[PDB]
Each structure stands twice: as C-alpha cells, then as structure tokens.
Coordinates of N, CA and C in Angstrom, one line a residue:
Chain K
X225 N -15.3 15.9 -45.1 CA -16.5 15.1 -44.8 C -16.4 14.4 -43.4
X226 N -15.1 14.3 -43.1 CA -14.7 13.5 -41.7 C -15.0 14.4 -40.8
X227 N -14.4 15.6 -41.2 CA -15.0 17.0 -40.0 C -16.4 17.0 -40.1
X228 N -17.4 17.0 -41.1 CA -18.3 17.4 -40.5 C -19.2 15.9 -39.5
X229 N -18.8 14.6 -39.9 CA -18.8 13.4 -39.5 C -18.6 14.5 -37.8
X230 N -17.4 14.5 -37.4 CA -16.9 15.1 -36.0 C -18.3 16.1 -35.8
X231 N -18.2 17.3 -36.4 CA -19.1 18.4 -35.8 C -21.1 17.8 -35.7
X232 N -21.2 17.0 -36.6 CA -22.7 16.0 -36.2 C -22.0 15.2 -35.2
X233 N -21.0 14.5 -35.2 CA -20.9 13.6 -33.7 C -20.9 14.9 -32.3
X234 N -20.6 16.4 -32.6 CA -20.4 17.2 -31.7 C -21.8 17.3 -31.5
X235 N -22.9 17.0 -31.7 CA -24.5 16.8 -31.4 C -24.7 16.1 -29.9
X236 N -25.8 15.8 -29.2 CA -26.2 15.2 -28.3 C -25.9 16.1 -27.2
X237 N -25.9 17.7 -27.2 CA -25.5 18.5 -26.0 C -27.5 18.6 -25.8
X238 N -28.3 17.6 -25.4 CA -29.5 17.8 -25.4 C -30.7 18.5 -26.3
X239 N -30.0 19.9 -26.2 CA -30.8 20.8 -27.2 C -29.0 21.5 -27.4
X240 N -29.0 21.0 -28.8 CA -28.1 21.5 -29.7 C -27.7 23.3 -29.8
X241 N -27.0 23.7 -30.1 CA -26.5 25.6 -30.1 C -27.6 25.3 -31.8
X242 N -28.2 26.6 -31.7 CA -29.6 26.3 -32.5 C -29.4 26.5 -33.6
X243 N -29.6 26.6 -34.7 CA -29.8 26.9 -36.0 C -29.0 28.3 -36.3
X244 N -28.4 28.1 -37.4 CA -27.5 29.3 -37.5 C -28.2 30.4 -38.3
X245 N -28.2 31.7 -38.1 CA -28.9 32.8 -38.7 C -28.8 32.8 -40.2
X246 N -28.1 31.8 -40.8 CA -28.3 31.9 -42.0 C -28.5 30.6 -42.3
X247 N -29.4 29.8 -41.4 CA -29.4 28.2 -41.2 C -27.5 27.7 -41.1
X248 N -26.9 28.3 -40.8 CA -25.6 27.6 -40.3 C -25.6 26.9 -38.9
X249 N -26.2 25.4 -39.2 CA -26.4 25.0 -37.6 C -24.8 23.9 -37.4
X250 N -25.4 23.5 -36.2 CA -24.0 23.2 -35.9 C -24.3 21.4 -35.0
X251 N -23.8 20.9 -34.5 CA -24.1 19.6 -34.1 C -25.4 19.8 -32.7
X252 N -25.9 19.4 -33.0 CA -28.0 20.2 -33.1 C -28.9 19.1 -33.0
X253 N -30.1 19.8 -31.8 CA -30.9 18.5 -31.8 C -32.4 19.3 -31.5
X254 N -33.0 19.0 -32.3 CA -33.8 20.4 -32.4 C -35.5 19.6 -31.6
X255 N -36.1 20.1 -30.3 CA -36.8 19.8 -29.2 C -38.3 20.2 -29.5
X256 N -39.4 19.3 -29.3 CA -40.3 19.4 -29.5 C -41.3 19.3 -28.1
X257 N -41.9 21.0 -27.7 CA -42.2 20.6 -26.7 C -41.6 21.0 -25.6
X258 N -42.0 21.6 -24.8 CA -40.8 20.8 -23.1 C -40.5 19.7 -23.1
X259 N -38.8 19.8 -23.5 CA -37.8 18.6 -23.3 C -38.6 18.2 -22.2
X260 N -38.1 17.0 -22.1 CA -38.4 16.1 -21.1 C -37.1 16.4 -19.6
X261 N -37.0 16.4 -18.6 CA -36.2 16.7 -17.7 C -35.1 15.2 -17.3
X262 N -34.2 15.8 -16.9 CA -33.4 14.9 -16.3 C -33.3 14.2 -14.9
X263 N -33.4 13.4 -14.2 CA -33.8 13.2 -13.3 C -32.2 13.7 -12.5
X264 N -32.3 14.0 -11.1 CA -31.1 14.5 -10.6 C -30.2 12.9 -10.2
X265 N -28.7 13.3 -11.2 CA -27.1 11.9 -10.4 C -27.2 12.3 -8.9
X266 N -27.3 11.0 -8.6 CA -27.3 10.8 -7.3 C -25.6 10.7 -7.0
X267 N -25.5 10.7 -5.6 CA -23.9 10.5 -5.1 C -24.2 9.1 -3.9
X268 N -23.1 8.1 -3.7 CA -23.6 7.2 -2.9 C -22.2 7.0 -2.2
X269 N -22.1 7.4 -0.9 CA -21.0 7.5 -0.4 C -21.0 6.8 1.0
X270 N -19.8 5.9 1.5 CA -19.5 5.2 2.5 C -17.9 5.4 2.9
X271 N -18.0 5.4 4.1 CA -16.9 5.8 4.8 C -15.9 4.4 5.7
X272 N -15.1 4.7 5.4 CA -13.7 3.7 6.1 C -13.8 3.8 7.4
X273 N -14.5 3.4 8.2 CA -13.6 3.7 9.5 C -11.9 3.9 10.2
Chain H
X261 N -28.6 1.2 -12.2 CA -28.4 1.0 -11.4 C -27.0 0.2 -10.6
X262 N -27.0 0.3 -9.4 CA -25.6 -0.6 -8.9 C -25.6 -0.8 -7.4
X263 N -24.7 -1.6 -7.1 CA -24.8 -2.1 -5.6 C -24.8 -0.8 -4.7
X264 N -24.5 -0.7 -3.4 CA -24.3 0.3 -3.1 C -22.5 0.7 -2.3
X265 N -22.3 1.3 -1.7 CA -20.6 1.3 -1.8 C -20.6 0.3 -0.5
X266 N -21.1 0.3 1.0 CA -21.2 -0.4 1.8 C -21.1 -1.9 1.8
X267 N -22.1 -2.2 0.8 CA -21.8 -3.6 -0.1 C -20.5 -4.1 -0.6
X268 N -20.4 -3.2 -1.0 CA -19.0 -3.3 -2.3 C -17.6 -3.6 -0.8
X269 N -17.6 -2.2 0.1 CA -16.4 -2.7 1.0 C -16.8 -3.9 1.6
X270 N -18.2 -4.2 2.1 CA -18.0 -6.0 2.8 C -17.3 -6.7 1.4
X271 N -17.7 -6.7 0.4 CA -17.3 -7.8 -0.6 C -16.0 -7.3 -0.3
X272 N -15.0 -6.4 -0.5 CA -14.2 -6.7 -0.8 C -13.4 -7.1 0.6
X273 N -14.0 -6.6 2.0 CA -13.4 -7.1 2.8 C -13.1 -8.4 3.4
X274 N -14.1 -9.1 2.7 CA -14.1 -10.5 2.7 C -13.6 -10.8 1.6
X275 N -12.8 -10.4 0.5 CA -12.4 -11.1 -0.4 C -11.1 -10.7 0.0
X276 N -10.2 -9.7 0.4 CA -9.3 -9.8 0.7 C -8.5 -11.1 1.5
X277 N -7.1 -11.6 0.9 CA -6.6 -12.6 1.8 C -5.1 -12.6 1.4
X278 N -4.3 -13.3 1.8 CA -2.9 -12.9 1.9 C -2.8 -14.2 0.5
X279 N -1.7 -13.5 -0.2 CA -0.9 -14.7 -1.2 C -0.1 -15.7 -0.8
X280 N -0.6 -16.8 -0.9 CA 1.0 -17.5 -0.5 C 1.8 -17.8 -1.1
X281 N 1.8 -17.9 -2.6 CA 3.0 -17.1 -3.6 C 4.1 -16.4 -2.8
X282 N 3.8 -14.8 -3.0 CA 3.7 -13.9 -2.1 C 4.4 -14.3 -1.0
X283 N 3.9 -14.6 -0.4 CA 4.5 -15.1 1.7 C 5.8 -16.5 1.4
X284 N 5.7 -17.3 0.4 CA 6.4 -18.4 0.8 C 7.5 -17.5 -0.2
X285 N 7.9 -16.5 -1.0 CA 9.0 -16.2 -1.7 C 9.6 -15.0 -0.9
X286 N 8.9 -14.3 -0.4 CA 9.4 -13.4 0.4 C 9.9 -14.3 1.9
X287 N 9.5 -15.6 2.3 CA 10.0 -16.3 3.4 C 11.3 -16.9 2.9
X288 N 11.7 -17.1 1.5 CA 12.9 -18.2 1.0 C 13.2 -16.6 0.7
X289 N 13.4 -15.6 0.7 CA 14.5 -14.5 0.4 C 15.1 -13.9 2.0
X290 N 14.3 -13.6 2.9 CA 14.9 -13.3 4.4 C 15.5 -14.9 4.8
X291 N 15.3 -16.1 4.2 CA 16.3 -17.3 4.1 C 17.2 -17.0 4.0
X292 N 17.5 -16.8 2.3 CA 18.7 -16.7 2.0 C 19.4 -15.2 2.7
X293 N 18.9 -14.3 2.7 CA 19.4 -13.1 3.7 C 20.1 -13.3 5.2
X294 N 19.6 -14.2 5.9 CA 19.5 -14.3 7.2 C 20.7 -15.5 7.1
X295 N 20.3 -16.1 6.3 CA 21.7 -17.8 6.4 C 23.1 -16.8 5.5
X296 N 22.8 -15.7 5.0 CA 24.0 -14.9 4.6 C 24.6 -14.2 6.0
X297 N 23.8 -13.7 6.7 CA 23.8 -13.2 7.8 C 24.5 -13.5 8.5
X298 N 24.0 -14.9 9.3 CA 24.9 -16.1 10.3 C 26.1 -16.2 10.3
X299 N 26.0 -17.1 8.6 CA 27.9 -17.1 8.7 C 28.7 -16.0 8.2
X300 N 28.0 -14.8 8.2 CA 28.7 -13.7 8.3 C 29.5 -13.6 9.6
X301 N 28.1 -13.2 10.7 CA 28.5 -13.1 12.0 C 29.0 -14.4 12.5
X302 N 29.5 -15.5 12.1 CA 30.2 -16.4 12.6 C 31.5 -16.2 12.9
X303 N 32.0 -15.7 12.2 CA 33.9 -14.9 12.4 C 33.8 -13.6 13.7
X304 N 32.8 -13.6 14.4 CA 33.0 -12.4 15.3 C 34.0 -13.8 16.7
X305 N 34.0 -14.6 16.9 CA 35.0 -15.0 17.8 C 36.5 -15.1 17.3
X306 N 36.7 -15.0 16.5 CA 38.1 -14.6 15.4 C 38.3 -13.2 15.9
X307 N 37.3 -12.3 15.9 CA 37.7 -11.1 16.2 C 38.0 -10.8 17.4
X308 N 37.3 -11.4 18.2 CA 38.0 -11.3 20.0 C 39.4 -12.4 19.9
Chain E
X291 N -28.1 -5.4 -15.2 CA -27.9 -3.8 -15.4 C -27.6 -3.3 -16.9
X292 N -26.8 -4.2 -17.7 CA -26.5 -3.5 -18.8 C -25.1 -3.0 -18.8
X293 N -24.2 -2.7 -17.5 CA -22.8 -2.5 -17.8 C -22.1 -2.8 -19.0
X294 N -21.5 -2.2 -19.7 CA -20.7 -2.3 -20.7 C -19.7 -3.5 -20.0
X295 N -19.5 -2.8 -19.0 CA -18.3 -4.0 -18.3 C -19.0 -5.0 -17.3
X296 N -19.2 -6.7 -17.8 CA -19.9 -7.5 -16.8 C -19.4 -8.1 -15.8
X297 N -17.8 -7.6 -15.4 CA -17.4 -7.7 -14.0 C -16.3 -6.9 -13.5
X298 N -17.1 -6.5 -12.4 CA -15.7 -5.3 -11.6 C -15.0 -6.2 -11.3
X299 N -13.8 -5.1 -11.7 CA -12.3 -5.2 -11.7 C -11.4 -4.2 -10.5
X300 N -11.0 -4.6 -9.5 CA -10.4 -3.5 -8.6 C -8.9 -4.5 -8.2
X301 N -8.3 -3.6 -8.7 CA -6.5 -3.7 -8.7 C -6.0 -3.1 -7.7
X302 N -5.6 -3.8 -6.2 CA -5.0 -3.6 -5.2 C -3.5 -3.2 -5.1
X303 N -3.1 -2.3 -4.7 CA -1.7 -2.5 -4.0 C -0.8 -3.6 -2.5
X304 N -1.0 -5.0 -3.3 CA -0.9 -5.5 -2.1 C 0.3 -5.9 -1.5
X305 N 1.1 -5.8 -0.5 CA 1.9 -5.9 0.3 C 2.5 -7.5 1.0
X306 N 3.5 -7.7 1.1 CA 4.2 -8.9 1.5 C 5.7 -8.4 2.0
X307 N 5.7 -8.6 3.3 CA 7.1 -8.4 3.6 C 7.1 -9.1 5.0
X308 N 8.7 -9.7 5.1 CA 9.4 -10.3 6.7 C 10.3 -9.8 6.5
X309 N 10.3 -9.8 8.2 CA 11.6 -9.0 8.5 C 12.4 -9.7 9.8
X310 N 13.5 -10.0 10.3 CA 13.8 -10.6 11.3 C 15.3 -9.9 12.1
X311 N 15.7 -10.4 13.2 CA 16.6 -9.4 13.6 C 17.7 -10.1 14.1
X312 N 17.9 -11.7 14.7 CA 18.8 -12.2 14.8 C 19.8 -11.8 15.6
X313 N 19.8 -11.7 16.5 CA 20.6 -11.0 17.9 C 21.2 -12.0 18.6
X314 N 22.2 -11.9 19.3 CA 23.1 -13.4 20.2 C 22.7 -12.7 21.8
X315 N 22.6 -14.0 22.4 CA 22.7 -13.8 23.4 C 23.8 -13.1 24.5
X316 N 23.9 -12.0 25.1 CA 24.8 -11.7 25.5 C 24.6 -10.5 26.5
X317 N 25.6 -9.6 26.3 CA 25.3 -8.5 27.9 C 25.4 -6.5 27.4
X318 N 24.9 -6.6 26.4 CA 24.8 -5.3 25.2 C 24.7 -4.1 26.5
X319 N 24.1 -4.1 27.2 CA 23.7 -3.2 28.1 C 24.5 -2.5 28.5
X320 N 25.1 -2.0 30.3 CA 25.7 -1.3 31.1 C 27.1 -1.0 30.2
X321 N 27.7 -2.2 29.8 CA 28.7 -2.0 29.1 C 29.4 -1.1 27.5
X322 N 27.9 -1.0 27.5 CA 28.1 0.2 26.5 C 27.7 1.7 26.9
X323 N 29.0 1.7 27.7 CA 28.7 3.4 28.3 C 30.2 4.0 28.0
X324 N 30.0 5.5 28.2 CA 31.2 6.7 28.6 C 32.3 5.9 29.4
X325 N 33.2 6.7 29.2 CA 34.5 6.5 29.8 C 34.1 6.3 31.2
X326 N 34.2 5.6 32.6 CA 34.3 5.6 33.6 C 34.7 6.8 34.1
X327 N 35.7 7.2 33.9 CA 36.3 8.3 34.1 C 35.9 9.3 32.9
X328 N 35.7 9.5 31.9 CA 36.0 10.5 30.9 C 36.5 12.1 31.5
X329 N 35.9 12.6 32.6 CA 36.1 14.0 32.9 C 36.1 13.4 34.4
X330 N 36.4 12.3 35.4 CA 36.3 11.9 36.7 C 37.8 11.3 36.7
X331 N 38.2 11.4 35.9 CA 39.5 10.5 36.5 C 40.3 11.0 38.0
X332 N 39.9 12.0 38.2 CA 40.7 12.9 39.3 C 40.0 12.5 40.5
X333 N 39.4 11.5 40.7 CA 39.2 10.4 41.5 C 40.5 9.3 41.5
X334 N 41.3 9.3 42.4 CA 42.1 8.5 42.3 C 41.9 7.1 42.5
X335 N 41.9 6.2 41.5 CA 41.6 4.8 42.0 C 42.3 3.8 40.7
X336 N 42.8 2.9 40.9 CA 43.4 1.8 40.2 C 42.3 0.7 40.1
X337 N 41.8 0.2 41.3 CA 41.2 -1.1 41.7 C 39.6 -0.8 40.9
X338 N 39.2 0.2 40.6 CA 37.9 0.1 40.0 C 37.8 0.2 38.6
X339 N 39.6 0.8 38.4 CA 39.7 0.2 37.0 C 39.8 -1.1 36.3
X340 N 40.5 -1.7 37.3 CA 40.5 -3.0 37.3 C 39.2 -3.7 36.8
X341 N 38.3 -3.2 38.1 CA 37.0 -3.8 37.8 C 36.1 -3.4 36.7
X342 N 36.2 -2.4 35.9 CA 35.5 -2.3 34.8 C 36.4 -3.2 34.1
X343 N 37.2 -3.0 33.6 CA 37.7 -4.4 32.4 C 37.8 -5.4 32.8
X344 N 37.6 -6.0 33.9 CA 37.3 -7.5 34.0 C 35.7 -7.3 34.0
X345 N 35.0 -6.8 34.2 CA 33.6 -6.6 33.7 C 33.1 -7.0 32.4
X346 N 34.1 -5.6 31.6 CA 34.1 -6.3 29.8 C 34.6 -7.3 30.0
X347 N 36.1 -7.4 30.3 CA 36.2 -8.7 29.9 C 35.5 -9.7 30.0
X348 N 34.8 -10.0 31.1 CA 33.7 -11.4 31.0 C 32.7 -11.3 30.4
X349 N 32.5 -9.8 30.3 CA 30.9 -9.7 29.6 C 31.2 -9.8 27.9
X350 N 32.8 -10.0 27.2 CA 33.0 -9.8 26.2 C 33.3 -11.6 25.6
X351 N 33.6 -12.1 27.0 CA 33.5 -13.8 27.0 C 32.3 -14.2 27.0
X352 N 31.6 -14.1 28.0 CA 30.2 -14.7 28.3 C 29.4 -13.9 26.7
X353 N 29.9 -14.0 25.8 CA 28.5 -13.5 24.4 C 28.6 -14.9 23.3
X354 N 29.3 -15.7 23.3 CA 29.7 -16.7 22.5 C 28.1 -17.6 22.2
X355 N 27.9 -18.0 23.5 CA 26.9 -18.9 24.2 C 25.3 -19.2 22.8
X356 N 25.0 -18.1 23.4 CA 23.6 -17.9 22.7 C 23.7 -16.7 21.2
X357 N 23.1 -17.1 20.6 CA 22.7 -16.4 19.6 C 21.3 -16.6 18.6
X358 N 20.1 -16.4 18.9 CA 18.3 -16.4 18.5 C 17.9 -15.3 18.5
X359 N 16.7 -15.0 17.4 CA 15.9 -14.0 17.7 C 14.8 -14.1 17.0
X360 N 13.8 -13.3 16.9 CA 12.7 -13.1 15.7 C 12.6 -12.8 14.6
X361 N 11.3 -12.8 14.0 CA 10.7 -12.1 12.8 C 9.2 -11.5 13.0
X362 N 9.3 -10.5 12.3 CA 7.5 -10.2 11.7 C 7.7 -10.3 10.8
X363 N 6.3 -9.8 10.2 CA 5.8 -10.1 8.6 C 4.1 -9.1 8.8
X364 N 3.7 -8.4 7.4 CA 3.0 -7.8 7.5 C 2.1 -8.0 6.0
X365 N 0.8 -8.2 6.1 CA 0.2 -8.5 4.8 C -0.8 -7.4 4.8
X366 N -0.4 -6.7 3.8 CA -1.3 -5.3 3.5 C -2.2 -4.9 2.0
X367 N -3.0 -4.3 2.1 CA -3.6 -3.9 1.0 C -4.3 -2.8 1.0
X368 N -3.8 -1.6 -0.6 CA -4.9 -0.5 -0.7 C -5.3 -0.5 -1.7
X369 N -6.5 -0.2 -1.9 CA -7.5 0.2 -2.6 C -7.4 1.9 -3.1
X370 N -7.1 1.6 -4.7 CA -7.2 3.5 -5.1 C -8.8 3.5 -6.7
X371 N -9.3 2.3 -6.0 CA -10.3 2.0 -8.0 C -11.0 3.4 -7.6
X372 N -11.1 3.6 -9.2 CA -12.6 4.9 -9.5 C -13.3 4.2 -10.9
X373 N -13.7 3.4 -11.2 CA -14.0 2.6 -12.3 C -15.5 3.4 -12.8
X374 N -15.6 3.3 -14.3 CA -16.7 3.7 -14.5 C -17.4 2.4 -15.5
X375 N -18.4 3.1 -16.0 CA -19.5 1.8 -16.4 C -20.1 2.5 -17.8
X376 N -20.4 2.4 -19.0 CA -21.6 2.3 -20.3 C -22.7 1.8 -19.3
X377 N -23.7 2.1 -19.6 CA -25.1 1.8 -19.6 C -25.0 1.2 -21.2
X378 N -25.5 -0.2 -21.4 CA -25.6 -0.7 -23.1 C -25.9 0.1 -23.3
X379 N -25.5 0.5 -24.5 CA -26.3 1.0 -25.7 C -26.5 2.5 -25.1
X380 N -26.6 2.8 -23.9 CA -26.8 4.0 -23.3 C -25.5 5.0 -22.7
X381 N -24.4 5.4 -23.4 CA -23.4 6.1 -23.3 C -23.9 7.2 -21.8
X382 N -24.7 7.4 -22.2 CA -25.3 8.9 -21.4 C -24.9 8.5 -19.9
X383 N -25.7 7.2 -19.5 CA -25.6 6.9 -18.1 C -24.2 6.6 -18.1
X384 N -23.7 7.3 -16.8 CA -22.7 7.3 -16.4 C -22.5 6.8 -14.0
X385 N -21.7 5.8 -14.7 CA -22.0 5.0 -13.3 C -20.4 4.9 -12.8
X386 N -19.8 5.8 -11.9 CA -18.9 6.0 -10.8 C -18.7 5.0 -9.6
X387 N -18.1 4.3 -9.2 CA -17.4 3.6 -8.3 C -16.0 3.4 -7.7

C-alpha cells in the first residue's frame, strides 16, 4: 500500500506516462485540453570583478 | 520572485566586517608565540 | 514571496590571521658571504684576513643593541552559498541563489 502511496507520489510529471493498455496506469495526470504552457526559468547572473 | 544577484553582492558587501572575537584571540596567541620567542632568543649572547 | 525559508542564510569562510617577524638590529648583510678566499687563496695575503674577522668580529658585537620588528594581519572572506527556496505551498517553483 506504501508502494503504491510512492508510485501516486511518482505523479506530477505534468502529463503523467498515460494509461496502461490494459488501464495499468502509473503515477498520471490525465490533461484536459492544451495543457496550459510553462513560462521559460529565467537565469540571473552577476559577476565579481 | 527574488532580489536580483547585484543586490544580494552589495548586501553582502556591506555586511561583511572583521570579528573582534576573532582578531583579539588570534592577537593574545602571536602574544604568547612571540613572548615565547624573545626569551627564547634571549640566550643568543651566551652563545657568542 | 512565500519562501519556505524567511531568511537567507549565507555561511562564510572567514579568515583571521597575524603574523610578525621580530628581527634585532644588526649587520645580517655583506657578512654572510663565501669564503674570502674559498678558491682565491693563492692570493697571498695575511692583513686582509685579518680584516675580514675583525669585520665579523665587530659586526658579531655591534648585534646586541637593537632588537624590533613588525606584524601583518589579514581579514578575509569567501562565499561558496547555492541556497534554494519552496515557493509555499508551491514545491514546483524552484528559486536558485
């Protein structure tokens, strides 16, 4: 029960590895739509003289 | 969000400052080093 | 902002050190050279032997006198932080410094 506790916490990869062919899904987040986009990490960098 | 890194080096370059902890215990150990020292080299007229 | 953590924390490597040298007054110099002769002896001379060891010799009396000198001291610090941040409640955001 604890493993599968782990394999639903293995969820949140955005859109989950999809539904298993025999419904064997796996830690899964199933998208309605065009996901919405991520906005691009920025980098903020300064230098030592 | 967050500061930006430019920021962050003035803060910390102004926060930087010397310990006097630090400076007054490292000054009483070259003391006692140095007054070991002395009368070490005090016996070099014995040697001539 | 929401940081998980509500105050940066940056752990220095900071530095404290004196150093001093304590030296006597005296005539360290010319006197610490080669043999006068080492490979010249076949210069025949007595009287300038003479004069090198009464040389040391005064210059081995005249050191008594004085003996002062200095110190430095250097106060340093580096910086190695890479700290990161929670966004509350928002794991996802991920904030580098």
């Amino acid at each position: 029960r604890n493993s599968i506790m782990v394999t639903a916490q293995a969820r949140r990869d955005v859109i989950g590895p999809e539904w298993g062919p025999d419904g064997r899904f796996t830690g899964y987040a199933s998208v309605i739509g065009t996901p919405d986009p991520k906005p691009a990490d920025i980098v903020n960098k300064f230098t030592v003289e | 969000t967050f500061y930006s890194p430019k920021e962050i080096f003035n803060r910390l370059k102004d926060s930087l400052v010397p310990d006097t902890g630090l400076v007054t215990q490292v000054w009483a150990d070259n003391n006692t080093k140095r007054m070991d020292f002395l009368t070490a080299m005090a016996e070099i007229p014995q040697t001539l | 902002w929401n940081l998980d953590q509500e105050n940066l924390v940056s752990q220095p490597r900071h530095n404290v050190m004196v150093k001093s040298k304590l030296s006597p007054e005296n005539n360290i110099g010319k006197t610490l050279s080669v043999n006068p002769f080492t490979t010249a002896w076949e210069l025949l001379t007595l009287s300038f032997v003479v004069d090198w060891f009464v040389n040391f010799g005064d210059v081995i009396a005249g050191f008594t006198g004085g003996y002062s000198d200095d110190s430095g001291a250097t106060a340093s610090w580096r910086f190695d932080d890479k700290k990161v941040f929670h966004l509350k409640n928002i794991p996802s955001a991920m904030v580098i410094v």
